[PDB]
Design a protein around this nucleic acid. Structure first.
Lengths: 61, 296, 169, 159
RNA sequence: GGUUGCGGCCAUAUCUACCAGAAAGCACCGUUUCCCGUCCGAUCAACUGUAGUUAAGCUGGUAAGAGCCUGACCGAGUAGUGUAGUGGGUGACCAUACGCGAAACUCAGGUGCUGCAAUCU
RNA sequence: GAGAACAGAAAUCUCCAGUAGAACAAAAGGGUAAAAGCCCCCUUGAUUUUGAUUUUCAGUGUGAAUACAAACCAUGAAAGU
RNA sequence: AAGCUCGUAUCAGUUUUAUGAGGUAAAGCGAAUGAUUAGAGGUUCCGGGGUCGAAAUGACCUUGACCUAUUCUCAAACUUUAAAUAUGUAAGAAGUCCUUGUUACUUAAUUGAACGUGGACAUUUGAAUGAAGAGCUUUUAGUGGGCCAUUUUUGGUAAGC
């Protein structure tokens, strides 16, 4: 449903995080930093292995 | 439970009860909205509905005209009509409701102008077909229903009551997706298995596993049938000859009656109490200021 | 009075909390299956926790509800484990009761090291005939006061048949 | 920057109704109105799709059609002196059931039996009821009720 | 008179704490070969009318209960508002003549009503 | 609020009380309970042609809403939308 | 100021009938704004910086965000929605009752509704009934700079606007 992936994207919410937890991971880290718990996010990189986004976020936090 | 919470007196202000027919539960405004009430494209029209209520699988059929003020019952078909004919028991099945639908299609039809018209078939085999009404004149009659609850399922005496009425001249645009013998997979219809629930083939089928298998409930279940000598193919003759009693005299003959509303108007107030006026019961009022609520 | 206001068990509901999904849960499930013959049901985490290590909708626990005869067996069978001694709490004001057991083996059931060792709890909800009034579709009602299951009434019931002991104050 | 474009604008009126309530009272879409039922611009609280001035209030035209929306009416815009043009009506939330064509037809129309009785009786008809003529000299009594002379209480000086 | 299905009626019903229920008419309980519906035959669906039962629900009765409603020259011909008017007054206010005219508190009474069909000593 | 094998004031399961501070597409507030809502299953009438009416208006432009008939679909045991 | 077309012909500073419309009262911040308050006690290879061992996961502090254990629960005038007291529209030859036609709507059913004709309710003909005229079209001039008092309403920290 990557369509609605970008769906929650353009959106998606804290319920959007629920939908996300129900490239591809481009939209991934996208709404990633979006919702940005951070633990969920480390595990995110987890399920993972985008890059730029993550790096920037880490540098800013 | 207000012995623990104990609400205040200001809490009861925005209180609003529903229907009398809601608490006790009798009327619904989501099915009746498309049953009694209707757009003014038809205006004043005696939309007769068939009220069906199977309690303990007991045959109950009621016909009430659609009126906003003052309902008038046209006809009624209960379970105290089959013992009158000759059918003792076995009136709680689908075949009984099937014969009831045909019986109500002759009793109500008698006062519905003519009785010769609106028939169809009398062979009774179980086949999905449409009744051919008389061209130019007698339009195909359509009977309306009135239930409320009862889950949408297959093999219902309530839902199959229209099927029995469909063979009585009553033309209703129904389907065949819910017949006892229908496959959920494909869209094929099997009239062979359908016939089993007409002559009581499914009833005698369970009896075959009682004289060799289930012997414990042999003396318990099926007892009234042995009293009328029903065990062989005599059960089939019951529903078969039941159609002959339908065209006999559908005038609904009253029972014993014996003294209606006259001599039986004095029984309740013979053991219970009543809310008598305080002017006569001053002995109980003056007793409240004595020791009941006046401290000894 | 009493005729027809006996005191059947409505249902026994065994329940296994497991702060995670995966093998360790499908194994808890396997336990409840072979023990009930019924295929058991999974429950998702309601919110996310972190100090419990769970996320919203994770699948975190299985359970299974069991009714009539089969109920009484597993009741007594695990009731054994508890040496026929509950406590004065354990019983709800609305007259049901429960207990936990750990080690689901202390009641029949072998070991199998590729299954592990799980607890053995489950609640027992009691009722009388005519419970249906509060439960059917049409004319749904609430059961009359002098018909409701209570703590007094259920404890006394337990103390009797089973013979088991109540305990505490 | 602003709030328009695709689907926005109008941040002055933003929903429903109340009053009686049972839906809108489930009998609006059922019954079809005819000649007499006026759909006064009622229920505009949530129906202000181009809200008019506060001056337009009270005037009424002539009903000629009943449908989904409302009936045709006029509002003699008494601005300055005479009345301007225009017609109005109202959406669907302003659809009512006027009782003016009810009570008036249960008092005058109810006395139709008193009209068909003059030629075979002797005049004295019509429902032109008398308003309230002053009472003349009536006959009263005294025995059974002893008169009593009252007096206002002496209001003293106090806070 | 009572009871069941189907309406009108929307606190004049429902809730806490009790009592009554000979007949008829409901419900609960029992069954799992077929159909529908679950993690669980509790609810729903299907089948049957032989067996525990006035135990639950409904109804009725009991009540200076609670809540709500009706009535009264009880509160109160009140308060507020309108018209007219050369009364006092700096402002904030307080009256008379001629119409209309608040709520709550106090007191008293009632404790669901009704049509059709069917059943019932 | 009252319980329990793994398990603490939070997680899983069960029961009781309970006339809506909720749910019901954006930010928000009354509704309504054998729900007008949510979930599962079943889906393409959220699309086209021919009329009329309501608010603004000069019985306007644009936009939006309500209510029929005449083709073409879906859901349902029936009555319907 | 200058014209045309008509007649039982335009209604009302006083009294009865309560169907619509509105955003001032109540509530919430648990996805919208704001004055979403005020502290203490821990844990450091490697969240980011020093001193001291040539070193090795040898050791020891301070200065910012959290968790556990408390308090308040966010002003009526940010927005949307939503009441009592109140005010138009309703006033019959233009309408109603009894007998009777038609059609492509409704119904099993010349039944109802909608749509016609004829007769009666005839001086109490649909509260009371004051009242030196009514409707439509066209054109021109002046005016787009005043003040004060009484009653009602908002604001109103002396004198006072």
């Amino acid at each position: 449903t990557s369509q609605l992936i970008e769906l929650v994207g353009f959106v998606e919410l804290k319920q959007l995080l629920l939908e996300h937890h129900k490239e591809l991971k481009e939209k991934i880290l996208s709404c990633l930093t979006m919702l940005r718990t951070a633990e969920e996010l480390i595990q995110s990189l987890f399920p993972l292995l985008r890059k730029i986004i993550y790096t920037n976020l880490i540098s800013l936090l | 439970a207000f012995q623990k919470d104990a609400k205040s007196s200001a809490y009861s202000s925005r209180f609003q009860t529903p229907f009398r027919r809601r608490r006790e539960g009798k009327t619904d405004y989501y099915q009746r909205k498309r049953l009694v009430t209707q757009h003014k494209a038809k205006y004043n029209t005696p939309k007769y509905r068939l009220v069906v209520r199977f309690t303990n699988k007991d045959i109950i059929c009621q016909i009430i005209s659609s009126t906003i003020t003052g309902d008038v019952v046209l006809a009624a078909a209960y379970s105290h009509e089959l013992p009158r004919y000759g059918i003792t028991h076995g009136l709680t099945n689908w075949a009984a409701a099937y014969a009831t639908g045909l019986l109500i299609a002759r009793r109500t039809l008698q006062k519905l102008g003519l009785d010769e018209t609106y028939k169809g078939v009398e062979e009774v085999e179980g086949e999905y077909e449409l009744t051919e009404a008389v061209e130019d004149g007698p339009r195909p009659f359509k009977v309306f229903l009135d239930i409320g609850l009862q889950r949408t399922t297959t093999g219902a005496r309530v839902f199959g009551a229209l099927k029995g009425a469909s063979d009585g001249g009553l033309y209703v645009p129904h389907s065949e997706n819910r017949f006892p013998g229908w496959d959920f997979e494909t869209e094929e219809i099997d009239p062979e298995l359908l016939r089993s629930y007409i002559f009581g083939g499914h009833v005698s089928q369970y009896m075959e596993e009682l004289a060799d298998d289930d012997e414990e409930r042999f003396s318990e279940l099926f007892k009234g049938y042995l009293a009328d000598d029903i065990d062989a193919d005599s059960l089939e003759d019951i529903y078969t000859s039941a159609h002959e009693a339908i065209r006999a005299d559908p005038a609904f003959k009253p029972t014993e009656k014996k003294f209606t509303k006259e001599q039986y108007a004095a029984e309740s107030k013979k053991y219970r109490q009543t809310k008598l006026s305080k002017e006569e019961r001053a002995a109980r009022v003056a007793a409240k200021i004595a020791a009941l609520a006046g401290q000894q | 009075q009493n005729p027809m206001r006996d005191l059947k068990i409505e249902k026994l509901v065994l329940n296994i909390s497991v702060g995670e999904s995966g093998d360790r849960l499908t194994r808890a499930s396997k336990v409840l299956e072979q023990l009930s013959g019924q295929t058991p049901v999974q429950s998702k985490a309601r919110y996310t926790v972190r100090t419990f290590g769970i996320r919203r909708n994770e699948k975190i626990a299985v359970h299974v509800t069991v009714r009539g005869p089969k109920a009484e067996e597993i009741l007594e069978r695990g009731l054994k484990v508890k040496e026929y001694q509950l406590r004065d709490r354990n019983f709800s004001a609305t007259g049901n009761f429960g207990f936990g057991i750990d080690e689901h083996i202390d009641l029949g059931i072998k070991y199998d090291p590729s299954i592990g060792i799980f607890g053995m709890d489950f609640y027992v909800v009691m009722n009388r005939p005519g419970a249906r009034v509060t439960r059917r579709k049409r004319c749904k009602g609430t059961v009359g006061n002098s018909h409701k299951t209570t703590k007094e009434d259920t404890v006394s019931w337990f103390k009797q048949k089973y013979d088991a002991d109540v305990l505490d104050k | 920057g602003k709030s328009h474009g695709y689907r926005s604008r109008t941040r002055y009126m933003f929903q429903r109704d109340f009053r009686k309530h049972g839906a809108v009272h489930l009998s609006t879409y059922l019954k079809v109105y005819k000649v007499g039922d006026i759909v006064d611009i009622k229920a505009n609280g949530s129906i202000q799709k181009g809200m008019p001035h506060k001056f337009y209030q009270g005037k009424t035209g002539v009903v000629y059609n009943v449908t989904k929306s409302s009936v045709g009416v006029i509002i003699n815009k008494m601005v300055g002196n005479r009345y301007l043009e225009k017609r109005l009506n109202l959406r669907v939330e302003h659809i009512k059931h006027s009782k003016c064509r009810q009570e008036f037809l249960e008092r005058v129309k109810a006395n139709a039996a008193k009209r068909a009785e003059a030629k075979a009786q002797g005049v004295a008809v019509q429902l032109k009821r008398q308003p309230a003529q002053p009472r003349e000299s009536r006959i009263v009594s005294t025995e059974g009720n002893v008169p009593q002379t009252l007096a206002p209480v002496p209001y003293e000086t106090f806070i």
